[PDB]
Structure formats: C-alpha cells, structure tokens
Design a protein around this ligand. Structure first.
Ligand code: OGA
Ligand code: MN
Lengths: 225, 17
C-alpha cells in the first residue's frame, strides 16, 4: 500500500509513546517519494506564484520579523487547486493526531491551523531559537513535514535544532524529504532553524488543545493589565 | 521576549478535527 502507514498503529505504537516520553517525534518516509514529490511540487509551484510572505511572529518585535525568522510562507487549508497533495499531507497528519486519541499529553486535540507552507529561500536565513507557543495560544503539537530532497545540513545547514526542556542535549532534525516531525509546541521544545543555505521547504501545522485554544482565542480578544 | 519569537498563527482560521 502507498504511504503513510496506518495511523492507528503508528500513532499508538510510536507517536504517542514517543511524544509522551520525548515530546519530539520523527517519522521518516511519511508519505513516500511519489507523494513527497507531488507536494514538493505543489509547494514550489505555490512558491513560484511569488505569493509567499515573510514569516511573522505572534507578537512582532525587533526592527524586523526577518530578525527572528527568515522564511517566506503561505497558508494552505489544503483544498486549494494545486495543493490537493498538501491537503493529502494535512489529512494524513490529522489522521495521526486523531489516532493518538487523548494520549498526547493532557491534550484534547480538536483542531489545527491551516498548513504553514514555509520556505527558507536558502540565503542563510533561519529562525532564531523560539518556542512555537510560549504563552499558551492553544498550540500543543507542532507537526512539520519536510520536503528537502538529499538535504545535507553539513552543506546547506537548515537544521531544526530542538532543545528539549530540562536537558543539556539538543536534537538536530534535518529538514529531510518526506520527514514528518512532531514536538510539543510549548516551552518544552525551544528550537531554531539553523541558517539554511539552500531552499528549505517545510509544511507546518499546529494542533490545538481544545481548552487552551478556547482560552487562547478568548484571551486574544482582550488586552488585560 | 519569547512571545516575539513565536511563529505567528491566525487566531481565527482553525481547522476542526
Ligand atoms: O521548519 C522548521 O524545521 C522549524 N520551523 C519553525 O520552528 C517555525 O516555523 O516556527
Ligand atoms: Mn517553531
């Protein structure tokens, strides 16, 4: 059968235990060469629309956002024509999360963001060390799909370095093709995209924990002091 | 601080699982 593997098995026998124990989980060859290629083509096609926009921060600061993240991005719901395979990816990611039942931490994943198709043009841009969700915006799981064929960080950098909270050892995740990455979006996983010296494509979706997200949105609305 | 480094996300267009 085509990729990916049954989500139930992968999630319950890998992602879940892996996530609870490490908070960082890598699934290589998630969709296989055919699909990975297709989405890598939809993403480059999307990129060629020149539509991508500099990556933005939750609470913008410092001269420019480019001081924090040097990727250009675009959001995909996954049903856009020319992004049906990204939709496929997104649905696969969703299937894995769904099959983790309620065992991803204390999280009740009931939703996610659109896919953030990201691209570090490859001019040495990266993403300084950050926490995807440091304030409790609802993001509990960060899911990333890499589209970088034969990516050699020794040459093109672009390593996603994650610093699992409490440890003095960091994980170096190569933005390699067909690689699916999962890691707690909160403070447990500060991480950085090391300077990418080649075009680095990744598709990120953040899963939301019902309660924290519900409270994220409500608190977003207000400004309190 | 961290808030200014975190990857921006819409607070409005969430996809329901
Ligand atoms: O693309 C990666 O490997 C990591 N990306 C991010 O951490 C981000 O966009 O906030
Ligand atoms: Mn991040």
């Amino acid at each position: 059968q085509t990729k990916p593997l049954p989500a139930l098995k992968l999630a319950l026998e890998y992602i879940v235990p892996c996530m609870n124990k490490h908070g960082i989980c890598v699934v290589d060859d998630f969709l296989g060469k055919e699909t990975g290629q297709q989405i890598g083509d939809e993403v480059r096609a999307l990129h060629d629309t020149g539509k991508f926009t500099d990556g933005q921060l939750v609470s913008q600061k410092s001269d420019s956002s480019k001081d924090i993240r040097g990727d250009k991005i675009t959001w995909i719901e996954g049903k856009e024509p020319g992004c049906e395979t990204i939709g496929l990816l997104m649905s696969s990611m969703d299937d894995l999360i769904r099959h983790c039942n309620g065992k991803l931490g204390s999280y009740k994943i009931n939703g996610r963001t659109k896919a953030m198709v990201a691209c570090y043009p490859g001019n040495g841009t990266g993403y300084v060390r950050h926490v995807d969700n440091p304030n409790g915006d609802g993001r509990c799981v960060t899911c990333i799909y890499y589209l970088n064929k034969d990516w050699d960080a020794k040459v093109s950098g672009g390593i996603l370095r994650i610093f699992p909270e409490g440890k003095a050892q960091f994980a170096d995740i190569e933005p390699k093709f067909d690689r699916l990455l999962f890691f707690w979006s909160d403070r447990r996983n500060p991480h950085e995209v090391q300077p990418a010296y080649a075009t680095r494509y990744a598709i990120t979706v953040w899963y939301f924990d019902a309660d924290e997200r519900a409270a994220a949105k409500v608190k977003y609305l207000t400004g309190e002091k | 601080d961290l808030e200014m480094l975190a990857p921006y996300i819409p607070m409005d267009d969430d996809f329901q699982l």
